[PDB]
Design a protein around this ligand. Structure first.
Ligand code: HEM
Ligand SMILES: CC(C)(O)c1ccccc1CC[C@@H](SCC1(CC(=O)O)CC1)c1cccc(/C=C/c2ccc3ccc(Cl)cc3n2)c1
Ligand SMILES: CCCCCCCCCCCCCCCC(=O)O
Length: 463
């Protein structure tokens, strides 16, 4: 008894009724014809889509457990092999996530807090930006090296030097796979597996980058083993190695060198491109909206000054900069469809029964753009996260990190990098448009699962 929906054609399903590019605009129109919940078939596979705050919440939150499964697929499977945190499910997930969540706490990796790794990075970033010499440029590459280096710093103790070859290769690697896997073709090939054979070259490249990466990590993990100081862990690998030590006897324990190379890999994948995107998107918005930046720089001056580096602690005294960072995520809507889930067993959702394994889809964007909770949801405006007094106004509708039992495993780190990197930049630079702001477009290109901001150029003018 799946929820209603467009009756499918045989063999293909509703495919030709869904714009594979902006598949969310497609879903939104379906909702106006079948309501909050509904089923669509990609190929022979059913997919029950949830639209609106109440549907997404009732599902993800209220029925948390049953909706905490990761919808998987032919591609996702052959890349990860069910290893790691993102793609795993059941027992192996719960144990890896729980270990990951606590090991990723501000101090969960030893004497050196993560904030300190982020703050040091926000530094090198500002230094690289000075190198542009105020000249117009595409911030994409520079902005990407920071979030990627933060992860390096979190899993490999030390951060790389931007010119270091290993870092550049480590990046291209992940970027290439990011671009491949973000093609509308992925949605097709995932449902019509046979069509993967039609992409020999691309198939090999993806697997090759994945293969090479695993090697590098493993080579790097041995370095950690042969130098492990059990009493004070250096990074993420140390913590895992220590945990592995304890389970030494349990032959069915998840903590083995295999999930370690996996979970590490996942960390880059899960926190590099997403952060980089929101960052690049955030600057574009601060550029397009000058009267906004001015206020943020005003808080920065008033609460941090030119006297020192911003730290997470200032955020409690900077309501506006907080509203901005919240509105940047709400507006830029990084993952409109959220990441596909799957119900854990036969699940009951008001009048409907959803078979175990079915693919779920909680449309985050439908929440982030609720027109009642956010009047004029399509205009970037910090007011959305501000009360009549200029005080921060938290929202239950703020789900860019998703919700429920499978909410972003690195939200904190994510929120920390956005606030640090963004305030640290605005402190040392002012944003200048190569052209006229009016000629500046801020509409995303959703030719894929990860919405992207339009390409642009900017001039970092040292204050
Ligand atoms: C701009 C920043 C980021 C955003 C908006 C974002 C958001 C997301 C979203 C929407 C999900 C899927 C949640 C679901 O299952 O429904 C996710 C999960 C995940 N994120 Fe992020 N992310 C970002 C950065 C980070 C960072 C910096 C890390 C690194 C620690 C991280 C690691 C993860 C991991 C490991 C998962 C998979 C969790 C699981 O399946 O149990 N994320 N993220
Ligand atoms: C990548 C992204 C968008 O930043 C992200 C961030 C946080 C959480 C999820 C995601 C989506 C990652 C999704 S891509 C899903 C797709 C559809 C499907 O197969 O079901 C679009 C193909 C995903 C889910 C589970 C595991 C993975 C593992 C990826 C991975 C694993 C190891 C890798 C080693 C080297 C390289 Cl160069 C790339 C590697 N990539 C990816
Ligand atoms: C083991 C993992 C295999 C993954 C195979 C993924 C196959 C899908 C390849 C899609 C390639 C799309 C290339 C077109 C790029 C473009 O010009 O838009």
């Amino acid at each position: 008894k799946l929820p209603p929906g467009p009756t499918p054609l045989p063999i293909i399903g509703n495919m030709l009724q869904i714009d594979v590019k902006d598949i969310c605009k497609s879903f939104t129109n379906f909702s106006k014809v079948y309501g909050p919940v509904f089923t669509v078939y990609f190929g022979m596979n059913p997919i029950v889509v949830f639209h609106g705050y109440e549907a997404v919440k009732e599902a993800l939150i209220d029925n948390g457990e049953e909706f905490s499964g990761r919808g998987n697929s032919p591609i996702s499977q052959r890349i990860t092999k069910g290893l790691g945190i993102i793609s795993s499910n059941g027992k192996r997930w719960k144990e890896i996530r729980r270990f990951s969540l606590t090991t990723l706490r501000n101090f969960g990796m030893g004497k050196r807090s993560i904030e300190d790794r982020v703050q040091e990075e926000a530094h090198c970033l500002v230094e690289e930006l000075r190198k542009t010499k105020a000249s117009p440029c595409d911030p994409t590459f520079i902005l990407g090296c920071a979030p990627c280096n933060v992860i390096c710093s979190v899993v490999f103790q030390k951060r790389f030097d931007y010119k270091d070859q290993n870092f550049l290769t480590l990046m291209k690697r992940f970027n290439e796979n990011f671009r491949i896997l973000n093609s509308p073709w992925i949605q097709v090939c995932n449902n019509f597996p046979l069509l993967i054979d039609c992409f020999p070259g691309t198939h090999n490249k993806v697997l090759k980058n994945v293969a090479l990466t695993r090697s590098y990590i493993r080579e790097k993990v041995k370095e950690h083993q042969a130098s492990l100081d059990v009493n004070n862990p250096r990074d993420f690998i140390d913590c895992f190695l220590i945990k592995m030590e304890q389970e030494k006897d349990n032959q069915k324990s998840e903590f083995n060198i295999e999930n370690l190379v996996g979970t590490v890999a996942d960390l880059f994948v899960a926190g590099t491109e997403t952060t980089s995107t929101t960052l690049r998107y955030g600057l574009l918005l601060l550029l397009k909206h000058p009267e906004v930046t001015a206020k943020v720089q005003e808080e920065i001056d008033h609460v941090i000054g030119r006297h020192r580096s911003p730290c997470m602690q200032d955020r409690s005294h900077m309501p506006y900069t907080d509203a901005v960072v919240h509105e940047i995520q709400r507006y830029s809507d990084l993952v409109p469809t959220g990441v596909p889930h799957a119900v854990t067993t036969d699940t009951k959702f008001r009048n409907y029964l959803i078979p175990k394994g079915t693919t779920i889809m909680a449309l985050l964007t439908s929440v982030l753009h609720d027109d009642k909770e956010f009047p004029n949801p399509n205009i970037f405006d910090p007011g959305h996260f501000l009360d009549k007094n200029g005080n921060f106004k938290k929202s239950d509708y703020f789900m860019p990190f998703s919700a429920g039992k499978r909410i972003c495993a690195g939200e904190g780190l994510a929120r920390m990098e956005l606030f640090l990197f963004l305030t640290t930049i605005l402190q040392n630079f002012n944003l200048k448009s190569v052209d006229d702001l009016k000629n500046l477009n801020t509409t995303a290109v959703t030719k894929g699962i990860v919405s992207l901001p339009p390409s642009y150029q900017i001039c970092f003018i040292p204050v």
